[PDB]
Design a protein around this ligand. Structure first.
Ligand SMILES: *CCC(=O)N1CCn2nc(-c3nc(-c4ccc5c(cnn5C)c4)c4ccsc4c3-c3c(F)cc(F)cc3OCCOC)cc2[C@H]1C
Ligand SMILES: *CCC(=O)N1CCn2nc(-c3nc(-c4ccc5c(cnn5C)c4)c4ccsc4c3-c3c(F)cc(F)cc3OCCOC)cc2[C@H]1C
Lengths: 142, 142
């Protein structure tokens, strides 16, 4: 089986049955938008950097990856064609997970449909997420 | 004629000539096991939930239903008799099909002998399957 399949089997997504967000949960957001923190390892010294994003609650994990690139590329050092290539490149290179936990967001679902996010919203807690390279995920498989 | 007989005539299986898997295809599996995706409709609003299973390639469709039952009841501390009762009940209530396509797995064949499954194995792709209520299939017959 493909490494993508084995990651799905080992780390199955914890999504809700409906993508429709309950009204009492949606009202806890800022006009349906949720503030999340995105971590990443940027240096060989395992130094971690972070971005604080405000995104729609129904963003899929691949849209979170794209939104984090737009946050960084605000300071322009690349053309538009280079930027589009970088978004597609890193969308196929990185996956999203909960920081410090064995909870992953490998499948295309609205972020708020994942159970970890809903508990974060109901608890008034900020989702603490990490961008991990797909190859680093495939190497830790049994 | 019986409704099950009518379903076989209307939806005949697309199977390969031999149940023996060629070596170059078998070697694409993880020690003879295939990872499949099983969808199901859980709410009257047609909300779908899914399981990602790793099963023997020569499981018959009724064994796929049994493996999905063991997946859900894994934590429930059920006895063998309790588990068997649920397995027999849902084996007589649900059939297996390709999700979103008019391809069915109604007959006792090794799953890998079906042409859709074997091509999935050769592609390194997960079979995208759906569990449909038997009565819903018999109602759509001519
Ligand atoms: C084609 C893609 C490409 O070449 N690049 C250039 C490098 N790059 N880094 C990130 C990225 N950067 C940060 C970040 C924030 C703040 C920082 C530093 C360093 N010093 N400070 C103060 C780095 C970051 C923080 C969280 S996530 C992230 C990313 C980032 C991203 F937004 C989306 C991703 F898919 C991956 C990454 O990180 C990859 C690890 O570093 C290479 C984006 C890029 C892209 C545009
Ligand atoms: C004696 C048998 C019996 O009473 N039950 C109880 C109900 N039941 N549901 C399933 C089943 N559940 C899921 C599933 C997975 C993840 C879920 C939800 C809801 N929320 N989350 C996060 C439901 C499921 C997903 C794919 S297949 C499946 C099944 C399932 C099965 F494994 C085998 C089948 F033959 C049928 C079904 O689903 C039938 C639809 O009813 C919900 C199993 C049972 C059994 C144990």
């Amino acid at each position: 089986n493909s490494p993508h399949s084995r990651a799905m089997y080992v780390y199955p997504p914890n999504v809700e049955s409906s993508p429709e967000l309950p009204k009492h949960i949606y009202n806890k957001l800022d006009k349906g938008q949720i503030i999340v923190v995105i971590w990443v390892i940027v240096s060989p010294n395992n130094d971690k950097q972070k971005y604080t994003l405000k995104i729609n609650h129904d963003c899929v994990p691949e849209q979170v990856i794209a939104e984090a690139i737009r946050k960084k590329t605000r300071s322009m050092l690349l053309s538009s064609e280079q930027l589009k290539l970088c978004v597609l490149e890193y969308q196929g290179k990185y996956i999203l997970k909960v920081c410090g936990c064995d909870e992953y967001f490998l499948e295309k679902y609205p972020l708020s449909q994942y159970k970890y996010i809903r508990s974060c919203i109901m608890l008034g807690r900020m989702p603490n997420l990490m961008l991990m390279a797909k190859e680093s995920l495939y190497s830790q498989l049994p």
